[PDB]
Design an enzyme around this catalytic site. Sequence first.
Site, short mmCIF file in Angstrom:
data_model
loop_
_atom_site.label_atom_id
_atom_site.label_comp_id
_atom_site.label_asym_id
_atom_site.label_seq_id
_atom_site.Cartn_x
_atom_site.Cartn_y
_atom_site.Cartn_z
N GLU A 1 -10.30 5.08 -8.36
CA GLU A 1 -10.91 5.20 -6.86
C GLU A 1 -12.09 4.17 -6.37
O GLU A 1 -12.40 3.30 -5.03
CB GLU A 1 -11.29 6.31 -5.96
CG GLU A 1 -9.92 7.61 -7.02
CD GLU A 1 -8.74 6.43 -5.86
OE1 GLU A 1 -8.50 5.95 -4.93
OE2 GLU A 1 -8.03 6.84 -6.59
N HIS B 1 8.38 4.85 -2.22
CA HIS B 1 8.25 4.06 -0.90
C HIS B 1 9.43 3.13 -0.79
O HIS B 1 9.56 2.98 0.73
CB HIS B 1 8.01 2.77 -2.19
CG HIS B 1 6.03 3.13 -2.93
ND1 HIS B 1 6.47 3.69 -3.75
CD2 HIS B 1 4.99 2.50 -2.03
CE1 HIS B 1 4.81 4.17 -3.54
NE2 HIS B 1 3.92 3.28 -3.06
#
Lengths: 647, 647, 647
Positions: C408, C538
């Site tokens: 992150e 996805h």
Amino acid sequence: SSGVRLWATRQAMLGQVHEVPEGWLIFVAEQEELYVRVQNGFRKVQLEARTSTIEEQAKTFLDKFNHEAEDLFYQSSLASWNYNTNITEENVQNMNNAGDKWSAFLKEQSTLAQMYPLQEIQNLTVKLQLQALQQNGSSVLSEDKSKRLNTILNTMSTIYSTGKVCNPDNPQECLLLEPGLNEIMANSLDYNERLWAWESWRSEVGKQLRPLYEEYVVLKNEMARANHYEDYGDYWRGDYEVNGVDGYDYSRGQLIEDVEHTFEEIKPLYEHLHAYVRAKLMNAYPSYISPIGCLPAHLLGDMWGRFWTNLYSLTVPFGQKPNIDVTDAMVDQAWDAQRIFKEAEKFFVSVGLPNMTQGFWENSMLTDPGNVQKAVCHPTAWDLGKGDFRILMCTKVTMDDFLTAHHEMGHIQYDMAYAAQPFLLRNGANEGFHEAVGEIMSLSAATPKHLKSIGLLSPDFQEDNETEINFLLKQALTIVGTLPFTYMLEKWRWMVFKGEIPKDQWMKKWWEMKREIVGVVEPVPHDETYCDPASLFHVSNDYSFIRYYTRTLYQFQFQEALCQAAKHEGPLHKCDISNSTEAGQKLFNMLRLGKSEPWTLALENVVGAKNMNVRPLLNYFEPLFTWLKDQNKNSFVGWSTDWSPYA
Amino acid sequence: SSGVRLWATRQAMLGQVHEVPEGWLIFVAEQEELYVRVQNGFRKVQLEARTSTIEEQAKTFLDKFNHEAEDLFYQSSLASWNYNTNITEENVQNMNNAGDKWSAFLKEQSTLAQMYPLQEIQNLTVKLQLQALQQNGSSVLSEDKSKRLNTILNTMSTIYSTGKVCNPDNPQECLLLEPGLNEIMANSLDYNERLWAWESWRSEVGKQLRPLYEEYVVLKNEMARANHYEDYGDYWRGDYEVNGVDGYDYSRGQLIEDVEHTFEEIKPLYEHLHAYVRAKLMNAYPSYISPIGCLPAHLLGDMWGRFWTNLYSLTVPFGQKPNIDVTDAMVDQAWDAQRIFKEAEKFFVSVGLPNMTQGFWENSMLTDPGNVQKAVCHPTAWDLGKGDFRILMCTKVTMDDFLTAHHEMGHIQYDMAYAAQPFLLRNGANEGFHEAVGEIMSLSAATPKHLKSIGLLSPDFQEDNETEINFLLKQALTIVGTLPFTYMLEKWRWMVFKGEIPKDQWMKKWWEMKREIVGVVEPVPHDETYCDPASLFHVSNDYSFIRYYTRTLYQFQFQEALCQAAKHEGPLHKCDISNSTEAGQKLFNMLRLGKSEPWTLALENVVGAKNMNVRPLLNYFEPLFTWLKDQNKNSFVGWSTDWSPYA
Amino acid sequence: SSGVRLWATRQAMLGQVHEVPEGWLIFVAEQEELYVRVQNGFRKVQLEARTSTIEEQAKTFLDKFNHEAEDLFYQSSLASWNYNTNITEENVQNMNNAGDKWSAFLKEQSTLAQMYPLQEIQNLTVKLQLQALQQNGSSVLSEDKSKRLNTILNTMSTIYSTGKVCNPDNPQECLLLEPGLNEIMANSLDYNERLWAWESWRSEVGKQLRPLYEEYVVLKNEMARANHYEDYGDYWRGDYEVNGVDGYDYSRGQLIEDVEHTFEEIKPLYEHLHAYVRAKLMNAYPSYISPIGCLPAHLLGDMWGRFWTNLYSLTVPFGQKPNIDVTDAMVDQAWDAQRIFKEAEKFFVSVGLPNMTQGFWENSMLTDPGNVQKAVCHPTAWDLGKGDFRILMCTKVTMDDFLTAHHEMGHIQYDMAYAAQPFLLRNGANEGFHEAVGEIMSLSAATPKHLKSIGLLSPDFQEDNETEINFLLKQALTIVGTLPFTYMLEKWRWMVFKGEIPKDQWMKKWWEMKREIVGVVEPVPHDETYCDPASLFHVSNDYSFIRYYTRTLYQFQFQEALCQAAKHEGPLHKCDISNSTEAGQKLFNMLRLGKSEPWTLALENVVGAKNMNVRPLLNYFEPLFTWLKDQNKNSFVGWSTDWSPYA
């Protein structure tokens, strides 16, 4: 567009301002003035004050090579001069070792230069130097092919040098080509003796050389293909070749074109000259020379008919008016080699060229170097490098030595002219440029105006038209006499290297153009066993004979430029450039470049044309041409190939 | 990479900077300022302080020519002016002798200019001036052809001048065309009297000028063909031709179609105009003009039917309603021609054009100087050169001469406007520009607004639509009425030059075009023996008749643009350009240029249209167009070619 | 004549500075600097401080958009951040309400963008901005087609998330996809339970997903075809497309070529990897998988086989050699989530990248805030814009969470780097570039030297070669193992979008590539009634999966470049980038480009290659490849499509 449009001088800009398009920068290279091409003229542009790529590595590699090259070449140069001045076994060894060191060193750089690809190298000088080094020579072939080609060259040169013939009347009485046969072909006028000397030389040498020459040609051809040439003629045509230069590139085929194109303009003058010699020969040998037949190949003043100068005795335009000689005046004025060289130096100073080095006198020898040491009396310049300039000869009190001294000094002046250029560029642009520059200085040194100016020719001496015709014809015999011989022989090697003439027609084709291009007939027939085209030095010793043809075109054009620069007033054969400093300066600008620039550019910067032409020669021998045509209006003009002394 | 583009003016580049890609240097030939095109704007690069060819010879050749040309033209203009204002033997001698030397001067410099080719010239102005000089014209043929062509023109000029027809009632009573025959078919309304004069002249002139016209046309064509033209019509079409100018090139063939296309859209306006004239002619000639037939040739108020101005008496929209005329007010204020020309001078200063030199006024014959010396009263302009100006006109204190003074002074202001141009370029763009300038200002002067401003018309004048139609129709008869006749006559002459109309059909096709294009039919059947087209002064004397049609198209475009620039509101015939300084400055932009620029560029800048158009014509006569349809609904619209007064 | 040469960028200048002759003035638009070229280098010239149309309108319209878009996006980001950090009904509405208003702003701006065409813009950056906003996408179709796409997209998303399968033994015992089914195939090693979990999921959920996925695929194709694409696969390929850039253009079709070309080069690595996993699967499942046949679908560690790390329990190269674990030191040193980010902050500072600002600590939570408010434990990087960068994660005291924070952190530092770009250009170059930045930071945080430098790795630990092999194979299962799965799924999704195969063979093709491309055979055959291709997140959520394959290609290339600057010696996987400031600056320059510059140039800048390449992948796992070949030389290498557990 609207880019950089730069030229040399502002006068060019004034004449080309209308040529320069709108927005193009007008930069004067010489004046360093920048202008912008605008509506109807140019405006001044503000200028500020003058202030790892492989190509960068090549520059480092090239310059580093020079320093090593300068030293090693000096050793080879010195070893040669010591050996040439004194021919001794010790003098040979150092020459061998220095040459072996020099030759081995060059190939290592040659291979190393070949490591650098020239396509990524854009500096004009640098790229030219590298390819001048990247040339691997015979090593582009196999070693055995290189071994055969070199050894044959050693043998073929040896055979020509040692070519000795023996008369059938006495087996033990054998005479070499020089001074035995050549004197016979020049001084002796006997029909049989000249015929035998001409025949025997081409028999015992041509028959032996023909198998060697046959293998030599293909070896020279295949390396040319290996070196990317259509033939070894193109390999020698690459010498004058210019590539990558805008407005100056010279194709190898253009060399063949220009030589043939310029030769056709020489035929009319030569034909009347050939007729006049035939007219004079038939006055001396009416049976041996037909009024329509070609000139016998053994009655031309030398072995191969190369020069008609020795025919001046049998072809004198005016016996009562001899050629202008001031050798006796030199004897009267007690002039000698050092004096003649000093006078030559003064003449070079007279045309503005700098005085030659004093170290020349200390190092070089002028007169005969005694007899304890062995040396060649032939005029030979010596640019040994590192400012070492010498000339090796035996200079006597003669015009020929006087003229060759000017001929050799001009080379030295050229030698120091490009000495500022690097070692690769430390040579003439082409093989004939330096020789041509040497000749014109001798020609100006031979000018009666120069002789009258220096007092060698008395003021009361008169230059009648008959003497001028005697001078011009003697010039024609020396210069125009060898032009057809040079033209065909080089063209002969062109097609022989190209293989146009098969083995079974080399001799037949040689006599085909002998009687046609040159109007010269062999006194007795020769077959393909004979190798008469290779019987000359340059063909036997692998030298492009075109140098003589090229320089003759160059020298007259250069002289014409000199006469224009010196503003000659009178016959072109009387053009003397004495006391013409500007002409030497203009010549210096050409010579200072040496081979740093294309020879076409140098030729144009002197004569105004990028292509060689025989226009000055037509102007030079124009009064002679009228006299020859007047003399030949009665006798037959031309040559009949069918006629032959053997038939 | 990047490029640099130069601009002549900074403001042009400022408006052309957004599309320039970033990185392109911005340079202006005037301010010499450096800018580099960057992201969203440009950075000003700091600049430092300021630090043979045929064209240059061509520029110098023109300038030397201009000095002598300006001097000799001034004397030729002065000598001719004396002959006009004082018609005496010596004055005629001065006019002839000065013109002869000027003619001799013109050909000498023209021949010398021929050694200065136009292709290598970069400057369009320099090339254009030489092109005017290098125009050999009739001299491209042999000398006899030019002389005989002038012999025809001399015979054409004399016969047209001396053309006298005798009344059958009295053989001694004979009348010339000017002013005898013209007055017959303009003032006298008797059909037979007009018919006799119309037929007698065309019979007398036709039988003696038709054979000359056939040869004269051929001679005119042959020189044009040798001058790289398809015919002499194309030779005249080269006046409007534009070459070598980007975005404004105009072809000779473009002139043909533009005149044709403009007239075709005029026909709907002209057919109603033709119908109303045809309808009104029936009120006076019930048995001589059919309601569907074409108009009689001599019943058009003039000689050749060109101008219908005298038809306004017979075809007035409202006879009771008065016409715009302050001629009485001209003499009520006790004025004269000098004051009228002063008002013309006041007109130019009102529109913003600068005042002219007093030298013009003291050299100009504005009124006939008594009767002892004869002053030519034909309206003309005199651009003598070196800032000398004269007006040849016997102006009186009348509105008709008031517009004539404005019309002639309009040429003078135009002539001095392009004085900055070279002598060759000291002329109008074409043959229809100076006339256009003088006409529109006179029309603006003739408007009530101009007359009321200077007190010539009382403010209580009623500007009702009744006077609007009457003024328009009188203008339409003079201007719109002559367009069909002008178009066909040049078109007919073009085909005669091109040979399209058969020689045995010139007369029938001339009237067939008159029947079709103009809606006018001859009252007597004329065969090819007649030469009615050549009865005009222009045709016999070889004057291009397309100038008037182009001038009419130009002037309306010029007028409408001025009215649009002056924010004129309402009918266009009431538009006055007085007290509009911007209009003169807008007008003067082309006037200074003269003929250096293409007329298409000149027309576009003044008006907004590159080529000719008839939109101002519709705007000028829009109230009349609607009014014509109202009156012509009861009769045929158009014409019938078959009908004739003789059948 | 030197002149001026201009370069837009330094890289263009440096790459072309070699060919610039000396004295040439060199200006760079980006640096706004002047240079004077010299021999083998360039000298900078110092400077002082920096001094209507649709293009102007577009720049104003785009500039005002950025500032307004930043606020509304920040509000949407703010509400979404609160919604994810606090799972409450009020927070759900705020995320939607702020998102809906932000989404409506994009649609309104897109409508205003469509009137600003790209081709009329001379600014490259401005042209790019409107392109990303003018893309109508799903709105190019009708309202109903767009509406029916939204419902099915959510329906297939909700069904995938709520995939419910119940054990046959207990009807009420129903396990969802997460954590029920995923843990079965990850931790549980029972073949039967994994077989049921894989089969039941693809049976019940696959039947429900198939009509939704097929309808969604068709709609996505319909819009793309109207969006100037061949299919929706090309629509996603348009994100990677680069056009109009000299030397940097990237075509959509080349993306298919590059993916296939790279995967072929990975096949030698994967064949041994497949062989070893097959060899190790036989050690645990000798009666289900043969040494020649493919692998069971559920024996890949997951139902889809995306992550093979779950197989490391049964495919470990050495079960005794410890892996790189420092979690013990983290607990001993009393580390927490804040220390992890602080150590991440220390690592980023050491490499030269900027540290996280004050807003991160004050606004971004690092652990789940108890049970009062539920936080989405999925690690997400929150670039809320306007100087607001946040990280959301339920970080624990673990090595796994230590890497995830760096993941992150890499995204957050990636986001802030291109803040200089406008808001529309403040985005990644493509969908795989940004994810590569996060992973390498986790990889860098997983390097033994980084742990040792920060004290996590005890210096007394010995880094054995076998541990490296275990580390590489564990990394290979996660990344190298997922490469074949991503290749086939995108290739299958390319087919379904382009419609190259009819719907009756979509599943047959899906397993055909599984058997061949992946070497994995389904243990139970599946027909078209199922939706195994959409069994991934996805595929079932309208998200491209090729972004991860590009992510893997980019991250290793990024990893190679970082070690290239670090000049590490030894294995690539043992390289560390700590205390390497020059690496961070060049990396930050890569991250600051964003989408304003082509990714091909960005990939060239970081590494040197503009195309995909697999050398870093092989370099990172170089010891692993030799180990796999050594171990798999005794076993069958490759796979057989025909073999099946059910056959």
